Amino acid sequence: PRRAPAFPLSDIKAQMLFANNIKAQQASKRSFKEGAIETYEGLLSVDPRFLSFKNELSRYLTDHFPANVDEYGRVYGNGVRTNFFGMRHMNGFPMIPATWPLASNLKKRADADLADGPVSERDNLLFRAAVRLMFSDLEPVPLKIRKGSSTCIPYFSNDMGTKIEIAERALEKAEEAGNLMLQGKFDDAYQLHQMGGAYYVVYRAQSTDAITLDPKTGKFVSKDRMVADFEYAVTGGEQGSLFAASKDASRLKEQYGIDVPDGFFCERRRTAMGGPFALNAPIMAVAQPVRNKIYSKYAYTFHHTTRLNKEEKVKEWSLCVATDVSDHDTFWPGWLRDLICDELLNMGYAPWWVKLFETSLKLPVYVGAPAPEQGHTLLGDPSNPDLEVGLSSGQGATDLMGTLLMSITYLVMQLDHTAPHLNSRIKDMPSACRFLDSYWQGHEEIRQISKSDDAMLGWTKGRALVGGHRLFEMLKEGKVNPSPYMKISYEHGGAFLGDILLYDSRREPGSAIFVGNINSMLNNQFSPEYGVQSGVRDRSKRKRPFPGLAWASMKDTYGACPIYSDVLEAIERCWWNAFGESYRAYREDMLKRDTLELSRYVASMARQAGLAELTPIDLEVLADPNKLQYKWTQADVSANIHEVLMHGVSVEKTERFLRSVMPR
Ligand SMILES: [Mg+2]
Ligand SMILES: [Mg+2]
């Protein structure tokens, strides 16, 4: 069922992806690299005192604070959902090998008994209504770009000036490029305007992953993570093998002279992709206005900020179902890309823009280095983009693609299993739009709060409530998938966008509260994804610009966890045992240094201004801007702080671009 073409780096098709500059050439050739991360300034993730600390703390906390999750996956009591062994990784050292990304997910979906298109006309109307509501009366805004982000294929530039020039040129030439693609001239569109080529595969660390302590043996067991070899990836699983990657860290002693304590493992590695910036810029210019619409008009379903903001919605429900989606991005259906494109064309969107959008979701992928002596291969032919990878992480609208799929998937689940009496309200496009508009505003007896693959489904009092309880029971049983679209189950320890839903004895949403996840505090403080990058002079370009600032927002973020104080005291005690120093004093010093450094970056901040005008969100984002890519949005951050992390193309250039894309 068609193997994807593959080209080695030596091939002209792969050579054309990398411009004639040092950075692009280094990116093409970059071999497998590993090493301890600089967790904090002057501290390596593999420092013997740090690993001794992690061993003592993970063991103590698991012992004293066992998980309090009921038969229905509801968190109660201590607010703990698993053991604390997830911190036991040699950060910066990955599992070997990392996966080869699947060129086609069609067989994967078919074998999982998932649909190859909308099942019924109702579902087809609902997916199409989502497009009409999301993409209709949009307002132009400046195109914001993350500082220090790469332009990837073909230039691999990290320079803001160059990135602004590339983006402005892309908005000027997107029409000409899209029209070339409509003529099947993909090579011309790429050669002339750098729109096409491929996604560049970067493997990112998932710093904490499941580890269990076997009581029988007293030995730790790391969660097996299945990886596809090259053959499996190019054949969509028809040939080759899917096997467990090796998380064994013993190798670090032999290879690097690093002492590996018992029960410490190599990190899980996830595929991440970087899009060709010239293709992403015209997509982002439409994606940002879409987010502004859904986060304003449909704020109920889509705009999530604080634990109390979430709580106010959930408390009004009679039933709250916390769902889980298995491997969202890899299962994301190409038929949805095609349905979205078809509907945008029906709405009157510029065909050239729709073509650029369609192409961004069929693009080839350049595999860097999954393991030593592996990679440097282009999957798919850039002359005719035809891949079915699912959802590419670096596509300009990935969040919206996952949100569109999932919001409708959950609504369909509620209709099928709980609310057949609402089917008569979805007869045609106008009625599908009116119903969805009402549902997304939280005006129906069936409700939801969602973001991509994370959601909480609600039922108020009414006819659907009884069905709601049967659906929850079906999820608990776990024998039948409630959706024809994706693999849905209930979350083991219900949470929404980082906040755990803490139930009491009643196990009802009315008396349940949202609390910060204490395990996430530990993940962020002791297992960061990236090092401090102390050699990157411009802090705003770092993955962790101001790590010290997270101490100032900690109480606001995690203070509501039942065991907050217990954890901080356990940290203090264990850090004293390991370093002979006060962790609290160490973090207070880092907080002071980073507060002072911050004023250099904020125009409104005087030489020693302090954090007085900054919110807890501002502080969490300055310590971890990745939270701005999965948890929060631009509007949640103070304007003077957003400017530290992002730069924009003028609204004058985007306004002119948007006028040419949009209907009448
Ligand atoms: Mg899952
Ligand atoms: Mg969740």
Side-chain angles (χ1 to χ4, degrees):
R2 312 177 140 201
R3 81 149 44 207
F7 311 91
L9 179 56
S10 62
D11 197 279
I12 184 66
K13 286 190 177 283
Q15 286 297 114
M16 290 288 287
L17 305 174
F18 308 95
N20 197 52
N21 73 56
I22 311 291
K23 293 255 288 282
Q25 295 301 128
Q26 282 173 157
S28 75
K29 295 180 266 218
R30 190 126 275 143
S31 54
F32 174 91
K33 249 74 184 192
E34 68 185 346
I37 63 158
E38 204 186 355
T39 305
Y40 291 110
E41 299 168 273
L43 179 71
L44 299 179
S45 64
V46 304
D47 183 292
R49 305 118 91 212
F50 193 55
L51 301 176
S52 177
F53 162 80
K54 280 182 159 189
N55 175 58
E56 197 193 354
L57 185 69
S58 64
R59 284 181 187 271
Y60 181 84
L61 294 180
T62 305
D63 229 291
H64 293 78
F65 309 97
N68 286 176
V69 181
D70 72 20
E71 316 85 58
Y72 287 85
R74 304 158 176 134
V75 183
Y76 65 94
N78 65 195
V80 174
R81 30 172 227 183
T82 359
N83 62 57
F84 292 84
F85 307 134
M87 70 177 64
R88 307 173 73 96
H89 301 265
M90 305 294 274
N91 312 304
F93 296 97
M95 67 186 202
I96 296 174
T99 199
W100 273 81
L102 241 66
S104 177
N105 68 355
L106 297 185
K107 167 169 169 64
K108 181 185 175 61
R109 287 191 52 83
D111 293 349
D113 260 76
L114 304 177
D116 68 359
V119 176
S120 59
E121 184 53 30
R122 182 200 58 191
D123 293 6
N124 179 47
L125 294 169
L126 290 169
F127 283 117
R128 290 175 184 272
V131 181
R132 296 200 86 104
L133 300 183
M134 287 189 173
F135 289 85
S136 41
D137 310 288
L138 310 174
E139 297 292 350
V141 287
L143 197 166
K144 301 288 190 193
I145 306 166
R146 176 76 180 98
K147 289 182 188 178
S149 64
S150 186
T151 66
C152 303
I153 291 163
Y155 306 120
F156 288 85
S157 173
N158 292 91
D159 180 67
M160 190 50 74
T162 307
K163 225 161 320 129
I164 296 290
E165 288 171 8
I166 287 165
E168 288 178 347
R169 176 65 179 192
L171 299 193
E172 262 177 47
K173 296 288 175 181
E175 180 163 0
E176 189 189 307
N179 285 330
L180 283 164
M181 294 187 190
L182 283 166
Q183 299 187 105
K185 296 167 178 175
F186 294 97
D187 281 348
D188 291 358
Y190 175 73
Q191 280 164 211
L192 286 164
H193 313 293
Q194 301 76 49
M195 296 188 196
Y199 280 96
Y200 176 84
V201 181
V202 44
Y203 292 102
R204 290 197 14 155
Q206 170 139 311
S207 68
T208 58
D209 197 12
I211 294 168
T212 56
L213 174 60
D214 189 332
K216 307 277 277 290
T217 188
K219 298 286 170 200
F220 292 88
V221 176
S222 65
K223 178 153 184 67
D224 280 356
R225 290 287 171 191
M226 300 303 121
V227 295
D229 57 15
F230 167 81
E231 263 301 290
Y232 193 103
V234 295
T235 65
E238 296 269 348
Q239 294 156 68
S241 60
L242 192 66
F243 59 100
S246 177
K247 279 179 179 180
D248 190 353
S250 299
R251 60 175 188 89
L252 308 181
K253 178 66 185 167
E254 188 190 30
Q255 296 181 83
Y256 309 107
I258 299 166
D259 175 76
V260 183
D262 164 81
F264 277 79
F265 302 92
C266 287
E267 292 174 307
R268 177 190 188 175
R269 274 241 299 229
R270 290 212 185 186
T271 79
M273 309 210 262
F277 194 56
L279 179 60
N280 269 347
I283 296 163
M284 290 162 73
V286 172
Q288 193 55 47
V290 173
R291 293 181 190 101
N292 295 339
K293 174 159 187 201
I294 73 158
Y295 299 150
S296 56
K297 193 173 187 179
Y298 306 114
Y300 184 92
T301 300
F302 306 118
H303 192 222
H304 319 290
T305 59
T306 68
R307 44 181 276 277
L308 263 46
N309 159 86
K310 296 165 189 179
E311 200 176 292
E312 287 167 27
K313 300 172 184 177
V314 173
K315 281 214 177 227
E316 306 192 311
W317 300 351
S318 297
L319 179 69
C320 179
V321 175
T323 54
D324 216 348
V325 194
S326 174
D327 219 321
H328 171 94
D329 293 357
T330 68
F331 274 116
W332 194 90
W335 61 253
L336 186 62
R337 161 203 64 232
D338 299 329
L339 179 153
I340 293 162
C341 289
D342 186 66
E343 200 53 29
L344 290 169
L345 290 168
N346 295 342
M347 289 169 69
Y349 263 70
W352 56 260
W353 186 86
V354 178
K355 192 63 180 181
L356 293 173
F357 190 83
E358 180 199 281
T359 309
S360 77
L361 293 160
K362 324 241 271 165
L363 215 61
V365 305
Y366 180 81
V367 180
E373 271 64 71
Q374 280 195 40
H376 312 94
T377 306
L378 171 60
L379 305 181
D381 187 342
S383 302
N384 216 324
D386 68 0
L387 294 204
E388 290 294 344
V389 307
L391 222 206
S392 308
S393 60
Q395 196 262 355
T398 59
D399 57 326
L400 300 171
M401 296 300 98
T403 295
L404 180 333
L405 170 72
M406 296 318 299
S407 190
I408 306 308
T409 292
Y410 307 132
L411 167 62
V412 169
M413 216 180 310
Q414 291 180 309
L415 290 169
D416 288 350
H417 304 284
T418 89
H421 57 275
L422 303 175
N423 291 329
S424 62
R425 317 243 320 263
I426 312 144
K427 285 177 161 63
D428 51 16
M429 277 305 301
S431 64
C433 291
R434 280 184 249 116
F435 176 80
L436 188 59
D437 173 80
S438 173
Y439 173 79
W440 276 351
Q441 288 186 68
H443 297 162
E444 300 292 325
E445 74 174 295
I446 51 161
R447 295 172 187 187
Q448 80 171 66
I449 57 173
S450 68
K451 189 170 190 181
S452 300
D453 61 349
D454 198 4
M456 282 188 168
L457 308 186
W459 286 263
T460 67
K461 299 294 179 212
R463 287 189 284 169
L465 185 58
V466 59
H469 286 283
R470 279 196 317 271
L471 173 56
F472 195 14
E473 195 61 41
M474 167 172 49
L475 290 167
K476 182 185 108 72
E477 289 185 44
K479 284 177 166 188
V480 174
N481 179 20
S483 182
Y485 305 117
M486 300 291 272
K487 288 293 213 185
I488 319 296
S489 57
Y490 71 97
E491 185 169 14
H492 179 266
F496 184 63
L497 262 16
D499 300 315
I500 285 178
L501 185 54
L502 185 75
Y503 285 87
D504 61 23
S505 58
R506 285 187 231 73
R507 305 287 204 265
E508 288 160 11
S511 60
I513 63 163
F514 273 103
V515 301
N517 184 351
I518 205 70
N519 203 71
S520 304
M521 186 184 84
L522 297 169
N523 291 350
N524 290 184
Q525 289 180 212
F526 312 112
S527 297
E529 181 186 344
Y530 298 99
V532 292
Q533 290 171 285
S534 55
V536 174
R537 312 289 182 93
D538 185 348
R539 295 176 76 118
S540 72
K541 290 187 176 193
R542 295 177 189 187
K543 298 290 178 175
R544 296 162 62 200
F546 304 96
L549 305 185
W551 196 248
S553 53
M554 170 178 68
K555 179 84 164 197
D556 196 87
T557 308
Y558 309 101
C561 174
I563 69 155
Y564 176 76
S565 285
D566 297 89
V567 172
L568 281 178
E569 287 199 312
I571 289 162
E572 199 72 5
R573 189 187 51 77
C574 292
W575 195 271
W576 263 114
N577 289 349
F579 298 92
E581 293 307 342
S582 166
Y583 180 69
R584 177 179 53 251
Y586 168 74
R587 300 305 310 244
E588 283 164 1
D589 293 336
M590 202 190 296
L591 171 58
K592 283 193 177 195
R593 294 200 314 279
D594 281 347
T595 298
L596 289 167
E597 208 41 56
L598 180 64
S599 67
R600 178 187 315 278
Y601 293 83
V602 185
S604 66
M605 276 179 81
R607 305 123 286 175
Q608 276 210 6
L611 308 172
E613 305 278 60
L614 311 186
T615 71
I617 293 169
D618 291 337
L619 305 170
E620 290 291 330
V621 164
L622 285 167
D624 182 19
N626 217 270
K627 284 184 171 74
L628 203 47
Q629 251 75 71
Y630 83 83
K631 189 177 174 76
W632 296 301
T633 190
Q634 169 183 87
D636 308 328
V637 182
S638 302
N640 66 333
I641 300 315
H642 202 256
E643 287 181 49
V644 170
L645 306 171
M646 314 288 284
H647 189 59
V649 165
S650 62
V651 68
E652 307 94 75
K653 306 243 184 170
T654 80
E655 201 179 46
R656 190 189 169 210
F657 172 76
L658 212 75
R659 219 130 54 211
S660 76
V661 170
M662 300 237 276
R664 270 88 37 92

